[PDB]
Amino acid sequence: MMFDVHVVLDNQIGQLALLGKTLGNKGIGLEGGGIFTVGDECHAHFLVEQGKEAKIALEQAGLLVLAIRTPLIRKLKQEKPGELGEIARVLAENNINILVQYSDHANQLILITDNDSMAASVTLPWAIK
Amino acid sequence: MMFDVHVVLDNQIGQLALLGKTLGNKGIGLEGGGIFTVGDECHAHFLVEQGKEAKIALEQAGLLVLAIRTPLIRKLKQEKPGELGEIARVLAENNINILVQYSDHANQLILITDNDSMAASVTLPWAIK
Structure with a gap:
């Protein structure tokens, strides 16, 4: 969408x-x-x-x-130092390179990676409500 | 700040x-x-x-x-198509080149230009409350 x-x-x-x-x-x-x-x-x-x-x-x-x-849309569950680095770490540990990252006006996390198929399952814990 | x-x-x-x-x-x-x-x-x-x-x-x-x-921090007063293009137009009409633009977690407009001195006065209408 x-x-x-x-x-x-x-x-x-x-x-x-x-x-x-x-x-x-x-x-x-x-x-x-x-x-x-x-x-x-x-x-x-x-x-x-x-x-x-x-x-x-x-x-x-x-x-x-x-x-x-169509990017992955995820959400950091709380605003805390290190939260973005934590989701980036789990992506890096799965050998996924992050090509684009930003936040939308709903403070949702927008991501484009070199393996969006795997990135979707890796980032399932950050799924939106 | x-x-x-x-x-x-x-x-x-x-x-x-x-x-x-x-x-x-x-x-x-x-x-x-x-x-x-x-x-x-x-x-x-x-x-x-x-x-x-x-x-x-x-x-x-x-x-x-x-x-x-330290960027200029401004605020679009309503979310409406063309609002970002309008502030960019007034900046362009004053011969100001926009080098960086994004929005923060408060939905405030973050700007870096090649004339932040003039850009501050040009973008005064978009000043934050």
Whole structure:
């Protein structure tokens, strides 16, 4: 039901504005994520419900969508130092590499790994209510 | 009072686990942010209160801290499609480039720009209560 939208923006003014207007004009709200600049490019990951519709609109605006994915959605059960490192440890102990991690507006944990099939069973203790 | 901690992790298992354990062992909680993989490196931005203490602990663990910064903290006043694109538009119209953007666990807007001095006055309408 929820999709991570991975867009590679140019390191230029107005790029986040174009992304947000293009999705806002379609009624697609951003449920979490952000943008990180790395050298000459800006990597955006935003969580949306209308993933396929967001991909079409962004590409029609000329933005490069690398992938839309359905992430694992989990929840840390309490806010405590070391909680994120603990779920990352159990994933690492199962030889699972974490490619994307962030939190949504419900404070739910959003994850993309190199083994989402195994990561789902490994992270079952953190399943949402 | 709040600091963004920019760490460049290796694209390897156990890196987020080392970051989270190192800060959790010091009692430093993660108040927001995430990690994005870009090629062979993983860029982490996490919001913490004990920024200087987090920098020391991460460097003693062998992790590369690119910078600690005090971000602008703003708040979208309602959750509505296009709201993020609107604040990004006003920033772009003032020739301000957005380098980092995400939301914290209070759903506050975290921003780092190439003109935080001007960005503070430009984004005054989005000031927190």
